[PDB]
């Protein structure tokens, strides 16, 4: 029983450590994609506005 | 089969095995006093007049 | 004249694009996604002639089933939002369901109808 309990705690250790690492790895790429999307949105909006102004 | 922890017991349940003694809830820091009840059951039934071989996993 | 008519618009995104082409050629100022101002008015004029006339006018009817072609399952696109803002309800089809051999690739989850119940026979209703 005591061997099993200790092994369970070790397994939970490793699983949760891997979970946090994967979460951070996902976070960095999500932030990168977010920044690219924001830049694209603002540049397209500005181009649309300036073209609409020049069209007159 | 004798299993402690229903979370892992459900595997052999779906594997349609007979459960003799099952222990589901226990403290994270169990004591010999806590295990004494299960030990008493294990020596009352499962005793040598009923059972001669075990393999623990 | 009291008859009953059904109309199916095969694409509407193509018509929207053609109108944008014509507007930009005629040097009209553009708006969202370079579309002209009155695309909503265009489609409202299109889809608001579908009605069930009263008995005083002859009892005619005219149902319409416009289609929209989506790119990679985009629902929040400008023209799809515009059209589903006009129609009574939407019926969805799904690429994964079609590829799994399920024809029609109906999606009961997202598809809605605003006159449900009143448009069924009693047996099917029950």
Q: Transcribe C42-105 into DSSP letters.
A: HHHHHHTS--B--GGGTS-EEEE------SSS-SSSHHHHHHHTTSS---EE-HHHHHTT-SS-
Would you call C49 a catalytic residue per the annotation? no
Residue with tokens 């109906």: C106
Supply φ then ψ for residue B22, to 5 degrees: -130, 135
Method: cryo-EM
Q: Are B26 and B5 in contact, with CB atoms under 8 Å apart?
A: no
- C-alpha triplet C86, C87, C92: angle, nearest 5°: 125
DSSP code of residue C10 = S
Q: Are A55 and C30 in contact, with CB atoms under 8 Å apart?
A: yes
Give CA–CA dist C61/C56, Å, rounded.
Answer: 13
Q: Do B30 and A4 touch (CB under 8 A)?
A: no
Q: Which residues contact C74 (CB under 8 A, 6 or more apart)?
A: C80
By C-alpha distance, the chain B residue nearest A2 is B30
Distances (CA, A) of C109 to C89, C91, C105: 13, 10, 12
Give CA–CA dist C65/C54, Å, rounded.
Answer: 21
Determine the angle formed by the axes of helices C13-25 and C39-47, rounding to 10 degrees: 140
**In C, which residues are within 8 Å of A55 by CB distance?**
27, 29-30
Q: Do B30 and A1 touch (CB under 8 A)?
A: yes
The helix or strand, by DSSP H or E, that contains position A9, with its residue range, turns out to be: helix A2-54
Q: Give the number of beta-carbon pairs within 8 Å between A and C.
A: 12
For residues C62, C68, C74, C77, the Cα torsion angle rounded to the nearest 10 degrees is -70
Give CA–CA dist C63/A8, Å, rounded.
Answer: 65
Q: Are strands C106-107 and C92-93 parallel, antiparallel or unpaired?
A: antiparallel
Length of chain B: 57
Whether B28 contacts chain A with CB within 8 A: yes
């Amino acid at each position: 029983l005591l061997d099993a309990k200790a092994s369970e705690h070790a397994a939970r250790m490793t699983a949760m450590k891997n979970a946090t690492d994967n979460a951070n790895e996902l976070i960095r790429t999500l932030t990168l994609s977010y920044n690219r999307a924001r830049q694209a949105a603002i540049t397209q909006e500005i181009t649309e506005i300036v073209a609409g102004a020049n069209a007159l | 089969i004798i299993v402690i922890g229903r979370v892992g017991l459900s595997f052999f349940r779906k594997r349609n095995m007979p459960v003799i003694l099952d222990i589901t809830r226990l403290p994270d820091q169990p004591s010999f006093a806590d295990i004494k009840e299960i030990a008493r059951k294990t020596v009352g039934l499962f005793a040598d007049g009923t059972f001669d071989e075990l393999y623990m996993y | 004249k009291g008859k009953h008519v059904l109309v199916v618009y095969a694409a509407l995104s193509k018509q929207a694009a053609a109108y944008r082409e014509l507007s930009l050629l005629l040097r009209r100022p553009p708006g969202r996604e370079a579309y002209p101002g009155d695309i909503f008015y265009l489609h409202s004029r299109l889809l608001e002639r579908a009605a069930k006339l009263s008995d005083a006018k002859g009892g005619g009817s005219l149902t319409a089933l416009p289609f929209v072609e989506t790119q990679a399952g985009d629902i929040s696109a400008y023209i799809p939002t515009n059209v589903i803002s006009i129609t009574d309800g939407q019926i969805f089809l799904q690429s994964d369901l079609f590829f799994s051999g399920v024809r029609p690739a109906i999606n009961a989850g997202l598809s809605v109808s605003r006159v449900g119940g009143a448009a069924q026979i009693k047996a099917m209703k029950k």
